[PDB]
Each structure stands twice: as C-alpha cells, then as structure tokens.
C-alpha cells in the first residue's frame, strides 16, 4: 500500500531482545519516526521479495507475534575467541552489512531466529562475519535483517517436507548427499521456506500464490501526516465495536461503515492474503518464505 507500508500487520514490533533503545519508533513501527531494524527493508532495490509482500510480516515482527521462535542462544558472541554456534551457519551466507550495526538477525536452519552480535562500541564488518571498533560517533539501536523474506501465521504441518534440489551436493549447511566427484562451488541466491515442524527447506524454484481475503491483517486503518488506528475497534456488520469506522468497498462489505461519524478510514492492503508455496509438487502454507545467498556445491 503505497502510503501505508509502515502501517504494519499484527503488532508491528521491529526490535530484537536486548536492544530496546529504539522502542519509541520500532515498537511498533508506524507512520512517523525512523527505525534502524525496519527502514532498510523499504529502500528500493534491496529486499525485492519483501517489497512484493510488504504487508506480510518481517522476521522480527513474526518473532514478536509468536509465529517464529527465538534460537537458543538468541545471539552469538561474534568476537568471542572460543567461537560461537552461529559461526558455521553465518559463514556459508554471503551477506552485506551497512556500517554502525551491532547486531544482525536471520532465520537459521531450524526455522528459528538467530543473530550475530558485537560488543558495545563495535560494529559488524561489511561481510557481517567480524566485529571491529565502530567507525562513527554512535551505533544504530537495532539489528540488520540479513535475508529477504516475509512471514505469516500457519497451522499447515510441514513435518514431512525436506530440501530437494536436482544435482546439488550441498546448499548452505545442508548436505543433500555425498558426491564422490569434482564439484563446482558458487554463491547462489536460493529460495527457501520454513513450515510448522520443519527445518529450512531450500527449493530449486519459488512458486507462490496468494488468496486475498477480508481478515483483519488484510486492512490498514488511519485516523479520518497519518496516524494509524487499530481495526479491532471497528464494529463488524451487525456487531458492536468501541469506535466508528468507514472505508473502501471491501471494508464495508464486512464492517459497519458510518461515513460522517467515522473516527477512522480502513483500506484493503495491496498484496495481503494467505500465501502458499509449491514444494516438490505439493502446495503448503509456510510460516516464512525468503531468499538468501549461500554456498551451493553441485556435481560436475
């Protein structure tokens, strides 16, 4: 929604635990204010999949809506001489980090959110693999999203789904099969999804479909310089609510529209809806869908 990209589905919380100095503008993200964990996602060019589904949830939003669980540990001490459990996963990802970030976050192989973190006064290097003393006067307050992805709630069981890629010996940290022969190696942009009770599923092809609907997250509302408005205060047709609302024809097909007396205006959010993905011939409803650039090894 051209003007409502900051009118977030769900709670709209774009912070990472332990970095709460940006909560005024990140918890929630809304029309006013800058949020270092979220604004980078709307820079055109970057995150083209998320911008195609920008009314779906971010990774941090999904975590705070309890759609995606936090990894344990939730953050990896990058500088630590003893190593850390993210290191292997991070090193197979080719990523670019702007300066002044102390933290960056990603969906790990378990389908949980992990993060790499520097000590205070240190920033992530441009490949996000090391920490160095900060180059600026101050660090950003949030965490850089390392993957181009979007999320949604889902109860579709994915326990049986696994990565299937033709002629791939290894993708990311996943060994699909041992290859006796000479292999080629490349950094490739690979689509992936995570499902309920599944690990990360890499795919040869991204095939998605959206069913539009009239559920609450399919709308954005604002006071009638925008101020957002919580649609749960709007009465359904024939129902009760704490405020009076109006909106477009889609909204008024489901909610009672009061026109003159309205406190708010509600618009259907462009591109919102139930997303499904085709995985090895079968359509499933994922929790998150994304791209990431990882090392892929293929039989020659």
């Amino acid at each position, epitope marked *: 929604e051209d003007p409502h990209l900051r009118n977030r589905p769900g709670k709209g919380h774009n912070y990472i*635990d*332990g970095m*709460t*100095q*940006e*909560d*005024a*503008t*990140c*918890k*929630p993200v809304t029309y*006013a*204010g*800058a*949020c270092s964990s979220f604004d980078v996602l709307l820079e055109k060019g970057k995150f083209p999949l998320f911008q195609s589904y920008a009314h779906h949830r971010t990774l941090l939003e999904a975590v705070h809506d309890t759609i995606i669980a936090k990894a344990d540990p939730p953050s990896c001490d990058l500088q630590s001489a003893h190593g850390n459990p993210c290191m292997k996963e991070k090193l197979v990802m080719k990523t670019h980090c702007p300066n002044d970030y102390q933290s960056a976050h990603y969906l790990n192989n378990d389908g949980k959110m992990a993060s790499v973190k520097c000590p*205070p*006064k240190y920033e992530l290097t441009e490949d996000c693999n090391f920490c160095r003393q900060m180059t600026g*006067a*101050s*660090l950003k*307050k949030g965490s850089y999203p390392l993957q181009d992805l979007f999320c949604q709630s889902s109860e579709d069981d994915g326990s049986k789904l696994k990565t299937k890629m033709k002629g791939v010996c290894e993708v990311g940290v996943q060994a699909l099969k041992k290859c006796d022969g000479q292999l080629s190696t490349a950094h490739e942009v690979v689509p992936f999804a995570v499902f309920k009770n599944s690990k990360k599923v890499y795919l040869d092809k991204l095939d998605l479909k959206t069913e539009e609907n009239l559920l609450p997250d399919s709308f954005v509302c604002f006071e009638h310089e925008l101020k957002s408005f*919580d649609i749960s205060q709007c009465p359904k047709i024939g129902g009760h609510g704490s405020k009076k609302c109006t909106g477009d024809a889609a909204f008024c097909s489901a909610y009672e529209c009061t026109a003159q007396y309205a406190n708010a205006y509600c618009s259907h959010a462009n591109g919102s809806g139930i997303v499904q993905i085709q995985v090895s011939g079968v359509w499933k409803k994922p929790l998150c869908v994304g791209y990431e650039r990882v090392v892929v090894k293929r039989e020659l």
Partner: antibody
Amino acid sequence: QVQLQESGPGLVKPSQTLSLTCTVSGGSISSGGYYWSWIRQHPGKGLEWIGYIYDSGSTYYNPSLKSRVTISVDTSKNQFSLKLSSVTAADTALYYCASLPYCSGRICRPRTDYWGQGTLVTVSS
Amino acid sequence: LPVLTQPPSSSASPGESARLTCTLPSDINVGSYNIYWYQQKPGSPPRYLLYYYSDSDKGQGSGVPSRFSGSKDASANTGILLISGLQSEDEADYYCMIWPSNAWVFGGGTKLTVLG
C-alpha cells in the same frame, strides 16, 4: 492531558503491608504502549524506581525490591496499585505514581512526563 | 541494578555554564543508552528536561529552554548535562536516568547551587 492521583493510608505499622492505588484520568492504562510506574523518594534523598506496568499486560520490578512488592491492575477502573510487604522505618517516603517517556528519533511516548503529586507514607507504630 | 554516580553537589554563577556528570559503571557503556535528565525544584515532582543518544538522536522536553543540552563522553563513560547562560531559576536537583531493558535506573542526583 493525562492526570495521575495516588491514594493510600499515610500511616502503616512496622512489618505490615503498605497498599497504594493510582487512578489515571485522561488516558487509558490499557493501550498506547505507555509505562505506568511507582517511584518513591525519601525526603531529602534520591529517587528509587519500584516497578512499572507496560499497558496493563506485563509487570517489571526493581530487583532489590521484587521479593516485597506486587503491582496489580484494574483496567475497568483505569487504576493500578502497589503492595509493599514487611515495611520498616526505611520505607517512609513520598510515593509517586508516574508515566515517563521513552524516546528515539525525536519521538517520545508519552510526549511529556506525567506525575501525581505523591502520597506520603510514614511507617510507625 | 547498575549504579549511576552523580556528584552530590555543583555550583556556578549567573551567565556561566554548569556541567553535570552521570558516570556509568565500567561493565555497561554510555554509548548504548538514551540518557534522560530530570530536574526537581522544591515542592514539585521531577520534570523531564531532555534525552540524548547521539548528535542526530536527541530531543528537548516541551517548554524546556534550549540552554539545557545533553552529550556523552565515551572515554569517561559519562552522560553530561550542560546548562549554558545559567539563570537563578535553574537552582535545582538534577537526576540522570537510563532505561535498560525492563528497568529504570536513576542517578543519585546533583544539587546545583546558583552563586551570587
């Protein structure tokens, strides 16, 4: 805009439980993402945070006091309350309820701080 | 839990500038936090003056004169309140405050006397 008003006994006996209530008018303690707090100040001394609620759903306490302190909420009456157990002469203080801003990027929530006038509590037999 | 140390008293003359310090303990870093400053005059609750995170992320309290400003000293791990063009009405107690996750931490406060 928002106004806060403390209510309570003024006198409590040693080892008893101090109970106080804050009534909020002009805004709702149940939405907006605001923090609603208890803070005390012994006359002639500093400020000590006791605990707060975030909207009406989560509660966090000063760790040095947590074992003696409960905060509860009455969303229907727009009130929150404090219970401090095992009181000693060291608990004699002026007890404020307050909502203080958190800020980032020039945006502050709330845009200004709100304080009640405070209620004086003397611990004495 | 962390202790914010403020000097118990300070003093300066009209038109001078008062510099008040708030030193964080060595295990946390001043660069990480919004620093909030509060003023308390006799008979009133404390009042929010301003917050400071960085030169590009800072704000003044509504109705608080511009002559109050905040800054940080990374090497000394201190937050600083600078009161320029000191006026008689500025005699007060000043408290610094930080807001780590799930806590409010107040400094001990500095009693500022305006001389002369």
